[PDB]
Description:
2 copies of one chain form a homodimer. The first copy, chain A, is of the alpha/beta class and 379 residues long. Chain A folds into 3 domains: 1-141, Rossmann fold; 142-292, no CATH class; 293-379, RNA polymerase sigma factor, region 2, helix turn helix motif (Rna Polymerase Sigma Factor, Chain: A), CATH 1.10.1740. The first copy, chain A, has 16 helices and 12 strands. The first copy, chain A, is globular and about 55 Å long. The first copy, chain A, starts with a strand and ends with a helix. Chains A and B meet through strand 8, strand 10, strand 11, helix 12 and strand 12 of A and strand 8, strand 10, strand 11, helix 12 and strand 12 of B. One NADPH dihydro-nicotinamide-adenine-dinucleotide phosphate (NDP) binds at residues 9-15, 35-40, 59, 78, 93-95, 98, 116-119, 141, 193, 195-196, 199, 257 of chain A. Chains A, B: InterPro entries: DXP_reductoisomerase, DXP_reductoisomerase_C, DXP_reductoisomerase_N, DXPR_C, DXPR_C_sf, NAD(P)-bd_dom_sf.
Amino acid sequence: GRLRVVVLGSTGSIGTQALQVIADNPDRFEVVGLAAGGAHLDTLLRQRAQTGVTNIAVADEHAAQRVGDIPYHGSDAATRLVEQTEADVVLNALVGALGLRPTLAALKTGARLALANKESLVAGGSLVLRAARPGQIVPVNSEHSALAQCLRGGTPDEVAKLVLTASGGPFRGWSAADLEHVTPEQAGAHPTWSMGPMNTLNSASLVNKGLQVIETHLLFGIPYDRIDVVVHPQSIIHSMVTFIDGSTIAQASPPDMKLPISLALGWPRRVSGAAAACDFHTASSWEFEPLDTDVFPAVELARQAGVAGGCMTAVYNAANEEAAAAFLAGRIGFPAIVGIIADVLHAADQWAVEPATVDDVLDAQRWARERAQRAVSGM
Amino acid sequence: GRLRVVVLGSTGSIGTQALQVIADNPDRFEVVGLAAGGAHLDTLLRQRAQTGVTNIAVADEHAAQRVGDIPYHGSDAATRLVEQTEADVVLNALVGALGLRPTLAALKTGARLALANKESLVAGGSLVLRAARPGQIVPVNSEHSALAQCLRGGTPDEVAKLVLTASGGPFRGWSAADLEHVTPEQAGAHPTWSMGPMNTLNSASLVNKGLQVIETHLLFGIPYDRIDVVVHPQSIIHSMVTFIDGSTIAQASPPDMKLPISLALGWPRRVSGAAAACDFHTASSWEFEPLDTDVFPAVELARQAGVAGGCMTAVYNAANEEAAAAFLAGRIGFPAIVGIIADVLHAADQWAVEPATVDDVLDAQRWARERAQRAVSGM
Ligand SMILES: NC(=O)C1=CN([C@@H]2O[C@H](COP(=O)(O)OP(=O)(O)OC[C@H]3O[C@@H](n4cnc5c(N)ncnc54)[C@H](OP(=O)(O)O)[C@@H]3O)[C@@H](O)[C@H]2O)C=CC1
Ligand SMILES: NC(=O)C1=CN([C@@H]2O[C@H](COP(=O)(O)OP(=O)(O)OC[C@H]3O[C@@H](n4cnc5c(N)ncnc54)[C@H](OP(=O)(O)O)[C@@H]3O)[C@@H](O)[C@H]2O)C=CC1
Ligand SMILES: O=CN(O)CCCP(=O)(O)O
């Protein structure tokens, strides 16, 4: 009846909007657990008071101490919260490949995994897939939500292509020469979406879209050569499916995460009033343009990593995390992010083996981070 | 397997395109019956020669006099062929009120009815709906085909709005003052070989859209106040569904009637290669803008007629036929088309009774034509 929801990363952008959806719909949903890093205790304490949930995980030990009487604390806290909390839905909105163990714990419980943490699927790969029932993983991001809705337009044998839309980021249309001068402040403001700091930078570099191409292949089982990316600056069309007869089915809404969040939580059932619809009483246009793959090769790199398979997507992601951190610190330039990913991937021969265990995945990421640092040291 | 198809109106635009789809897909379809009026008897006779189908109907006895071996000829030849031919699908691409009895007969056989004939729903209304079983009628029109596909995005209970797109016609954005000066020639009237002069006019006047709104209500059971029209000059998006959560699902394809025809024939199964898909390698935009209902009141009039019910929509359509032909003959100006429809409808409340027979519908149309004629002449 009422779905019991554990919210991991409750204090971030996705987590807060998820709590708002749940608060607006006490008929459909109830929060039963919260996990956070500890960097925003004000927010977390506010959430504790508002939801009445004391079943809480805090990653940072000093922060958990500061609060007092937090039942789960330390780096395995989110995972143990998931293992020990009875739930129908686990919303994983943690950031980074650190969401991997909670993702795997969630799947092992049999709960629906409402997945915002793309990195756990990208890194985990077949390891995560083997742990899931069909339909157990339900994507929270707007692109995959769109695709899931659009796929209802036909049978699986009728699918020709999945078309992912990308905003193009703040630097859409820029030359490679132009990109050399980009600052962390210039890359820090998204034209259409309000997200956390990592998702915002990844949108500017197109790595977000590369990761989403990987997730698409893993979630929906479609070959990489049938996953297209088109640039759509308005971010109103969220993605499309083209069928074998020539028909395309597209999903559209004004950008608002509460829509895909609500659908992921309540899948298959839509949540009335979750978000504003497109308003056709006023003029608008939906524009499409090809991605410039020469200036922005991150999606092509993602495909190459995805095709190689095994632990190579974990390498792609881990290489990004390192180079991105070096960009935000002011150590390397903007175009060095995707350049280092490329350098790491093409040295990553050994990592095409399929992971048997989390340890295999961790091993690949450890290597990639080290190799990424070596690439940074060289510039 | 292979669907047995009867094609009614086989010498028209829809009928000949359907026959192409069928000739291109002998695995999926076989023609088992052909029906035409007799004005293009030669084409019908070529179709018999080409397809090998001898099960043919000709409405015009005079035309039938030319041949000597037509199994069905005279008034109701098409109805009789339907009654006596074993089929899985009847494509009704007949034009005008004479499509109505064949529709009723096709429904009675239990075959799927791929419906192009506008009068069957616009005029026949509750007579047709009471005869049809759920899902029996599959629309051929590109807008209705789009809606049927988009309705796959949720349950019936999840539908908020149906949004039909309209090109806006040749006078899109024109003021009322502009519209005073409209000539027949400008209203897309040419001696075009594949198009009735009324269809281009009905598009220009926005009456075509009004008729599509009525058919939408009847096909999908959505109230008139939840059926919207948006102007979309590119005609790439063929229509859209907005769901209760705020999500909109849209169907997009480059204009080509073989797409909706193939799907109507094969429903629910798509036909591979029916039409070209949208191509995103080249930049494009899809524009939307509201219709000025004050300059173009034809759609609101249609809703008024539809809400009234009974035979009121037959009156709407019949009043248009008279007024539109009167404009084309230079007996009235362009703005007076919808003006006369309004006047006839305001006088027409006796026709809000539900029709018991086809004759009730024909009487409504007779009255509406006579009423419109008086309006045109000043008598
Ligand atoms: N934002 C969006 O709209 C979109 C999000 N995504 C995905 O959603 C995920 C998160 O998005 P977003 O909420 O914006 O990111 P945020 O940075 O805004 O939120 C990150 C959350 O994770 C928590 N966290 C950080 N480190 C740890 C840790 N070591 N242990 C436990 N919890 C931790 C933070 O708590 P705290 O900071 O208080 O310590 C915070 O609540 C990402 O993986 C991203 O790819 C996908 C599509 C779009
Ligand atoms: N054309 C389009 O793309 C669209 C069509 N529509 C609707 O779909 C319907 C069909 O489209 P379309 O094929 O172009 O129309 P057409 O006029 O091009 O073809 C009409 C068909 O009806 C036949 N016919 C006429 N009278 C009789 C009769 N008494 N008995 C049996 N058959 C008869 C004609 O035979 P003959 O030629 O010998 O007279 C012809 O084969 C139309 O009514 C239209 O309103 C809706 C949207 C777009
Ligand atoms: O759900 C929302 N997103 O994933 C936004 C992604 C932004 P991008 O299209 O620029 O990567």
